[PDB]
C-alpha cells in the first residue's frame, strides 16, 4: 500500500557547524520542500529505491524490526556498497565490495560507535552525499498520533561525516528476517532560519513556495504589512538552438605547410594565405609530438567552432 501522505513542515537541519545566537540566516542547500508528499510503504516488500540527491527516511515503529540500510550503485560484486547495520549495542559500517548478505573479498572499511536505536516513537534520518562524503542527521521525538507525520517543528543534528568517495545511486531497506516508514526526496532550495537564543532553530520559511513566502524572503522578516513590495524578475526561456555556418563545403589543404622539407630560413620566411575553406584542427593533433603547443591567442578547445576572415 504505497499511499501518499502530506509531510507538512518537517525536514530542516543545521547547515553549518557554527553557533549563532539570534539572527535570521539565509542558506541555500538541498532540503525537503514544504507541504510536499511522501510515499508510505506499509508492508514482496523492500523495493530498491533510487537515490537522486538525498533521502528523508522516517520511521515510527518501536519493535526495532528496522535494521540498517544498504547503499550501492550496482548492488553486486562489481561495485562497493555501504552495509550500515545496527547491532544490539553497536553500529557497524562497511564500504567495500559485497555480493549478497556473502563474499566481501576485495577491500575492508570499518567504523563502530554507539547505536542509532537507543529509544509511540518517531525517528528521522537524512542521507546526503557530496564531494566524496556521507552526511547523516537524526533526531528522535515521541508522538502518539499514529501513522501520520506530526504538524510540528523539530530540527536535526549531525551524527557522522565520514568520507568514502563512492558513487551512490540505489538505496534499500534491511529488516530482520525472523522478527512502516516514509521516503521523501530532497531538492535544491533556499531557506530562511530563526536561531532563537541558543542556536535552537524555532522557525523556518521556504523561499520558493508562495508569493507571500517570496516577499518574506526578499526583506529579512517574518511579518509584512500593507504594501506593494517588489520581488524577483521573470524572463521567458528559449527552446531550440539553430546554427547556420556558410554554404561552402570544400576543405582547404592546410597540410602541405605542415609536412614538407626545408621550409625556409628564419629570415626571408615564406608566408602562406589560407581562405575560402572549411577546415578542422583535429588533423593537427594527428601529427608529430609538439615541442610546445602552448600558444597565446585563443583557447584551443573552441578553435574548432569559429569563423574567420583569413
Amino acid at each position, epitope marked *: 500500500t504505497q499511499s501518499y501522505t502530506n509531510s507538512f513542515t518537517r525536514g530542516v537541519y543545521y547547515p553549518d557547524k557554527v553557533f549563532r545566537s539570534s539572527v535570521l540566516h539565509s542558506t541555500q542547500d538541498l532540503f525537503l520542500p514544504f507541504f510536499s508528499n511522501v510515499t508510505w510503504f506499509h508492508a514482496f516488500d523492500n*523495493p530498491v529505491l533510487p537515490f537522486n540527491d538525498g533521502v528523508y527516511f522516517a520511521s515510527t515503529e518501536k519493535s526495532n524490526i528496522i535494521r540498517g540500510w544498504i547503499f550501492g550503485t550496482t548492488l553486486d560484486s562489481k561495485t562497493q556498497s555501504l552495509l550500515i547495520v545496527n547491532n544490539a549495542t553497536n553500529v557497524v559500517i562497511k564500504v567495500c565490495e559485497f555480493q549478497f548478505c556473502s563474499s566481501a573479498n576485495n577491500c575492508t572499511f570499518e567504523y563502530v560507535s554507539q547505536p542509532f536505536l537507543m529509544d509511540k516513537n518517531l525517528r528521522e534520518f537524512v542521507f546526503k552525499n557530496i564531494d566524496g562524503y556521507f552526511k547523516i542527521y537524526s533526531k528522535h521525538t515521541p508522538v502518539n498520533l499514529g501513522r501520520d507525520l506530526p504538524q510540528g517543528f523539530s530540527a536535526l543534528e549531525p551524527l557522522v561525516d565520514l568520507p568514502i568517495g563512492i558513487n551512490i545511486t540505489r538505496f534499500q531497506t534491511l529488516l530482520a528476517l525472523h522478527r512502516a516508514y516514509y521516503v521523501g526526496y530532497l531538492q535544491p532550495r533556499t531557506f530562511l532560519l530563526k536561531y532563537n537564543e541558543n542556536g535552537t532553530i524555532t522557525d523556518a520559511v521556504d523561499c520558493a513556495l508562495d508569493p507571500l513566502s517570496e516577499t518574506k524572503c526578499t526583506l529579512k522578516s517574518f511579518t509584512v504589512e500593507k504594501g506593494i513590495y517588489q520581488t524577483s524578475n521573470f524572463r521567458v526561456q528559449p527552446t531550440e538552438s539553430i546554427v547556420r555556418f556558410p554554404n561552402i563545403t570544400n576543405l582547404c589543404p592546410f597540410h602541405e605547410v605542415f609536412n614538407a622539407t626545408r621550409f625556409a630560413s628564419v629570415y626571408a620566411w615564406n608566408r602562406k594565405r589560407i581562405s575560402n575553406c572549411v577546415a578542422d584542427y583535429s588533423v593537427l593533433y594527428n601529427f608529430a609530438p609538439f615541442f610546445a603547443f602552448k600558444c597565446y591567442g585563443v583557447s584551443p578547445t573552441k578553435l574548432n567552432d569559429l569563423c574567420f576572415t583569413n
Partner: antibody
Amino acid sequence: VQLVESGGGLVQPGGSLRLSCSASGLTVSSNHMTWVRQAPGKGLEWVSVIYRGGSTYYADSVKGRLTISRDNSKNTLYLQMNSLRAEDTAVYYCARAQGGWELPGAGYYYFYGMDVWGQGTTVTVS
Amino acid sequence: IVMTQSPSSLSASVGDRVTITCRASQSISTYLNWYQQKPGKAPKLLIYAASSLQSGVPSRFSGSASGTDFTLTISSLQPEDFATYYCQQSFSTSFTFGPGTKVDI
C-alpha cells in the same frame, strides 16, 4: 482489443505532421501509452510517453519538437511533429504500458512492459 | 542506463536451446523484458519481469535473472523461431533498448 495508426507521408524538411493512433478495446481515458520510433535497420528508440494522470515525458533528443496529446474519449491519441531534420524518417508505432505509481519528487519507475502493438506508419522527409 | 547483449549473432539448428544474455549498468532489480522482432512486421512480447510469461507462448520460453545479469532460455528452437531479440529495461521511465541479437540457421 487492437489499435492502428494513420497519417504518414512524404514531407519536405521543416514541415508539420499529425499522426493518429486509434484504439478499439483500450480506453484512452485512464491508461499509459507510448510511441516507439524505428529507423531503418537501426533498432528501436522510445520517443514519447503519456500516463494515466495526463503528464508527458519526451526523450532527450526529440525535445521541444514533438508533442503527444490525448483525446477525451474516442480512443484516438494524436502525436504532432514540428520541424524535422531529415533524421526522423522512420516507422512509428504506438503501444500501451502496464502500470506504475507516482513517487513524488521523481517520475514513474516500476513498469512491466508493453502489451499490444500496432503495425506502424512510415514517415519520410525529402 | 546502458545494456548490451551477448552474443549478438546466434547460429544453431532445430531442437536446440538459446543462451543469449543481457548485461546492464546500474541496478534494475528484476524489471527486464524480452522482445521478439520479426524481420519486418512488428515486435512481440515474450518475457516480462525477467521470469514471468505473457501466456501467448508455451513453456518453451523462460527467463532467468542473477544479480544484474539476465538470460533467456528456449526449450526447443523450432524452425518458426527465427527473428531478432531485444532486452529492454523498465526500472525507469525512460525505456532503453539493446543493440539487437540475430538468429541464424
